[PDB]
Structures are given as structure tokens and as C-alpha cells.
Symmetry: C2
Subunit: 295 residues, 2 copies
């Protein structure tokens, strides 16, 4: 079975970036945003079904995959959110739904906060806002997510370390994120590997993690200060695991948005690849139930 | 001016290790234990003065410098504490004072807890027990001390990363720990570098950080559970910086010991090399004031 049958591969030229996009379908627009250390191919088990009923846009985040900044570039979520407005606008959409996984969900919620008239509906796949993540840091968090702290160290420490044997570190990371499950299509994996072998991609990824510590967290705090919330329907699909008090993802998203629903999914953090049929059932139901929002 | 004038370099053969020791002087015994990523040479600005009045023993911790386990070796603080009892015993001392810096202080307090009749007095240079460190973890801690989380990742992840360009990572680490101050004698630095270029040393260091997460923290908790405290006079000399509530080093040590004193030292964490004359004044006064304890 082919990867992304019928998707058309584009390169969009925006103000600050050259962005890889893959498109298919007609109907209401959906923008799907992958995470780390991946590319748009992470959507290969979900996007074709969606494209039966919707206009589907898959993008490589700035610096990831085949997308690149034109320069000391800005790799903050706010910058990558602007890339999405420009990308969708070029394609003919002023308003659209956003489905994000991992770093993509972080771009997505920032986009929804800053541009509430553009974002029709928002789905987070196993992500809460960075503000909430930082408040939860303890010994166990920092051991589990050691890379959040390594990749945020000043330039060029982590670039040196991860750049020595890049494919080894990429593969290790993917296995660890999948909890050892065999979820990576071997051809998707060669695309992930090729990107991670590019020093510019590894640098962009460190810059993402640096932004998460700094400007991205400042942005989230300023919204919390203002009482600024996502204005669209929100769905969160989370990994089935125990959540400490105040850390349940549904509870968290209800502090950020007035219209929130969600479900636990039995799988790893890698929801697009690990649990595509469970994700699809939820996504399709959510999009159907909020068809007015999409208008 | 020479490094360690008059010190005699020994190799002791213990049950589980081949240990590098350097000795000088006569009188009451002091055992000085360096930290990461260093060797016994870190004491070169302090040990000669002490050796005017005391029997001074400098050791490389198991796996560090020129010290090595005979094998899946145990690199827990309890194991390294046993090395110190055996080392001092061989040299002719059943009871002795311990002065530790960084990982050395961790070996030292474990030794004092487990073997209260052996440890006459204990000095910690800018260290509190690991139990207290773990309780303090938050976003800022994990960013500052990112390596505590990296080097504790399962074998052989951090060995791969730090082993790629070892001398670069060693030098970077030393500069960062010194807060950019020019405190490393160029010949001491070649000894630190040579050790870090040895894959067995890098592995031993990761094993130390793994133990800190696991068995070392379990040991400290069991003592806290039992209400077991250091029985000797304790001195703590700490870096002058702000301490959050419950995190002041004097306050912390008073929860672990009935007889505690200390002082703030204007310098980096690298007290032996950065502030030797301030450290000496305090050490000498402490040892003089507790001359009965040493008997
Ligand atoms: Cl994430
Ligand atoms: Cl330490």
C-alpha cells in the first residue's frame, strides 16, 4: 500500500521560509502539523482517509523535513504559526481546522490563540501547552524528557552532541518515543533519517526546544495573564496513562478553551502512527459534530 | 610553582578496585575526595597547605582519573565509600576526617552515615544530599543541571553522545562549571582531559549519575526514614547565591546532622580551584576547633 496516494507535493515561498506542503482532496480545509523528530509523512495512516471528505494540507514545520528558513532565523511557535497562515492563505483558505501532534500541536494552539478568526477547530494529539509542561517538571519528568533540557542548552552544545552520529540518535529517539513498538513504515523512516542527517534540520530542532523554554512560554503566560482562550472547538486525544492532580489533559485544555472534548487512546505518544484507526474515529466524529464551526 | 610538591603517588589494590592515591604529611588523617569531571589534582591549591599539619590522602574516585574497578562494576556512593574505608585502612587509619567536593562530598556523606565510627569530621564543599537535590527539581534546575538527566539515561546513550568529541565536551563542561573564570592550571587540565578521553572513565561517570537517580537516593531515603544522621562535626562551605525556602545548605545539613557549621564562599561551584585561600581559612579553623573529635 502506497504512502500518501494522490497527494501533490508543493514548495511554497513565503516571506521568511521555503515550505514543503503535500495536498489532497476537496471540501473544508484541514491543516495537519507533525512533530519531532519527524516530517509530514507521520500522517500517512490518517491523511488519505481525511482527504476523502476534506481538503487536506500536510506541512513540514519550518526547519524540519524539507522546510527551511530563508536565514539567525526565528523558530518560535509564533513564527511557525505565521508560516501556517501564509501557507493556507496561498492555497486559498483564510479559515481552517488544525490537527497537530507533538511540536505541531504547539504551533497549532499558538496559531489559534493569536488568530482566532483563522482557526475553525483545533485538535491536539497528546499535547498540552508548554506553560503547563514547565509547571509539572520534577525528577521523573526531567529523566523521561531529558532531551527537552539537552536540546535547549545554548548554541552549539546539543548540535555537537546529536550531530556526531545522527542516524543512530534519530533511530534511538524514535524507538524510545514508540515504547519499542514497530510503528514506523520503513520508507517514512528513511525520510525522517534523511532530514535528521541535515545539520540545518538538527539546528532548527534545537532552536524549537530553546524557544519552548523562552519566548514560547512567555507567550503562553501573557495569554494566561490576559485570560485569552482558544475560541474554537477543541479536541484533545491523550495517551492512556496516570495523570497527577492538575495534569489531566482534558482538565488542562478546559483552562485554555471554553469548548473542549476528548478521549484517552491506548497507544504511545506517537498517536498518528501507533493508533491511526482510533484517532480517525475520533477526528471524524469531532469534525462531523462541528460542521457548523467549519462553515 | 609545582603541583603537589612532595606527594607520593600510590596504587592500592582493594577487593574491587585499583585505586590511585597521592599522600603527604604526618599527623591526624584527612581524606580529600574530588568530583566531576575531575581527579585528585583538583586539590592542588589546598592539599599542600594541609599537609603541613595533617596526614593528607588524595584519591581518584573509582572509575575517575587513574582509579578503576576490577570489572558490570558497582559505582554507587556506598561502593565508593567502601573503597575509602579500605584505602585508609591500608594506609594505617581506622578513623579519619573527610573533605569532599562535588561527587566526592556525596561519597563522603554516605561513608559517614554508614560508618560513623570511621569518620571523625566531614566537610562538604558546595554539596547537599541527593535526596534534597531531587526534591528541588524544577524547570530551572533541569536546564542548569541538564547533564544530571543526560548522563543518567540508560546505557549506552550518554556514553555515545559524550564520547564523540570527548575533549571538547570536557573543556566545555569545565568552563561552564567555572562560570568562565580562568581557574584551571594548564597541567591539571591535561590530566582531566586524559581521563575524559578514556571511554572507561566516561562510562564510570555515567554510572555515578545513574546511581544518583537510583540506589544512592534510595539509601538516603532509608536513612531519613530511620532518622539516621551523621554523628561527627560537619562543615558546609557553599556558593554565595540565593537559596529558595528549604534549600539553604546550612539548613539542609542541620536536617542530616546534629553538629553543623558553615559559610558562604564568593566563587563558583569549583571551590577547590576557584577559592582555595577562603576554603583553607575555613577548613583550618574547623579542623583546629574540632581537634578533640580527631583524637
Ligand atoms: Cl511536544
Ligand atoms: Cl555534585
Amino acid at each position: 500500500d502506497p504512502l500518501l496516494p494522490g497527494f501533490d507535493y508543493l514548495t511554497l515561498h513565503t516571506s521568511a521560509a521555503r515550505l514543503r506542503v503535500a495536498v489532497k482532496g476537496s471540501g473544508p480545509p484541514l491543516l495537519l502539523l507533525h512533530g519531532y523528530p519527524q516530517t509530514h509523512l507521520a500522517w500517512h495512516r490518517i491523511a488519505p482517509r481525511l482527504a476523502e471528505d476534506y481538503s487536506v494540507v500536510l506541512a513540514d514545520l519550518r526547519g524540519y523535513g524539507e522546510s527551511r528558513a530563508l536565514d539567525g532565523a526565528d523558530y518560535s511557535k509564533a513564527a511557525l504559526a505565521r508560516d501556517q497562515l501564509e501557507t493556507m492563505g496561498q492555497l486559498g483558505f483564510e479559515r481552517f481546522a488544525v490537527i497537530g501532534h507533538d511540536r505541531g500541536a504547539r504551533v497549532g494552539y499558538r496559531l489559534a490563540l493569536d488568530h482566532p478568526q483563522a482557526v475553525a477547530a483545533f485538535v491536539s494529539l497528546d499535547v498540552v501547552p508548554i506553560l503547563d509542561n514547565w509547571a509539572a517538571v520534577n525528577k521523573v519528568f526531567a529523566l523521561n524528557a531529558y532531551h527537552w533540557f539537552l536540546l535547549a542548552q545554548p548554541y552549539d552544545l546539543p548540535e555537537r552532541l546529536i550531530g556526531a552520529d545522527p542516524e543512530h540518535f534519530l533511530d534511538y529517539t524514535l524507538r524510545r518515543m514508540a515504547q519499542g513498538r514497530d510503528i514506523y513504515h520503513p520508507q517514512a523512516l528513511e525520510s525522517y533519517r534523511r532530514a535528521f542527517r541535515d545539520p540545518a534540520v538538527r539546528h532548527a530542532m534545537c532552536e524549537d526546544y530553546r524557544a519552548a523554554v523562552g519566548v514560547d512560554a512567555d507567550a503562553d503566560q501573557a495569554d494566561r495573564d490576559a485570560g485569552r482562550r482558544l475560541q474554537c472547538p477543541v479536541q484533545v486525544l491523550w495517551q492512556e496513562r496516570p495523570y497527577a492532580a492538575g495534569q489531566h489533559p482534558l482538565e488542562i485544555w478546559k483552562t485554555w478553551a471554553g469548548q473542549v472534548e476528548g478521549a484517552a487512546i491506548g497507544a504511545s505518544h506517537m498517536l498518528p502512527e501507533d493508533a491511526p484507526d482510533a484517532v480517525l474515529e475520533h477526528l471524524l466524529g469531532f469534525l462531523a459534530s462541528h460542521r457548523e464551526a467549519l462553515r
